[PDB]
Structure formats: C-alpha cells, structure tokens
Amino acid sequence: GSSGSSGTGEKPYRCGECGKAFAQKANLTQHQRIHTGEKPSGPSSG
Ligand SMILES: [Zn+2]
C-alpha cells in the first residue's frame, strides 16, 4: 500500500493511556491496541 501524506490539520482525538493524538479515530482506536495487553515482542512491525 504505497500512499503519500494525507492533508490533515491538528488532531482532536488524543489517546488516554499515553496521551497520543490522531487526525482520525480509526488511527487512534488501532493505536490503543498497543496498550491493551503488552506483548513480549513489542511494537516494531519493522
Ligand atoms: Zn496511547
């Protein structure tokens, strides 16, 4: 999935666990997953 940089302003949505932010919820909701049960491997997806 090769895409560019979507034109989005500030981010109204701000995570509650850490305090992150995102222009769209879909981006945040998927982020919270990082907190929900910490894995041994860790968030790398490299
Ligand atoms: Zn967070």
How many angstroms does the Cα of residue 3 sit away from the middle of ligand 1? 24
Exposure string over 1-19, b if 16+ CB within 10 A, otherwise e: eeeeeeeeeeeeeeeeeee
Phi, psi (rounded to 5 degrees) for 41? -65, -45
Please state, in angstroms and rounded to a whole number, the distance separating the CA atoms of residues 28 and 13: 7
Tell me how far apart the alpha carbons of residues 18 and 27 are, in angstroms, rounded to a whole number.
15
Give me the residues near ligand 1 (ion), CB cutoff below 5 Å: 15, 17-18, 20
Distance (angstroms) between ligand 1 centre and the Cα of 17 equals 5
* Span from the CA of 1 to the centroid of ligand 1 (angstroms): 25
- Containing H/E element for 13? strand 13-14
Give just the sign of the alpha carbon dihedral 34, 39, 40, 43. Answer: negative
Q: What technique was this entry resolved by?
A: NMR
| Domain residue ranges of the chain, discontinuous segments joined by + | 1-46
Instruction: Judge contact between 21 and 11, C-beta under 8 A.
Output: yes
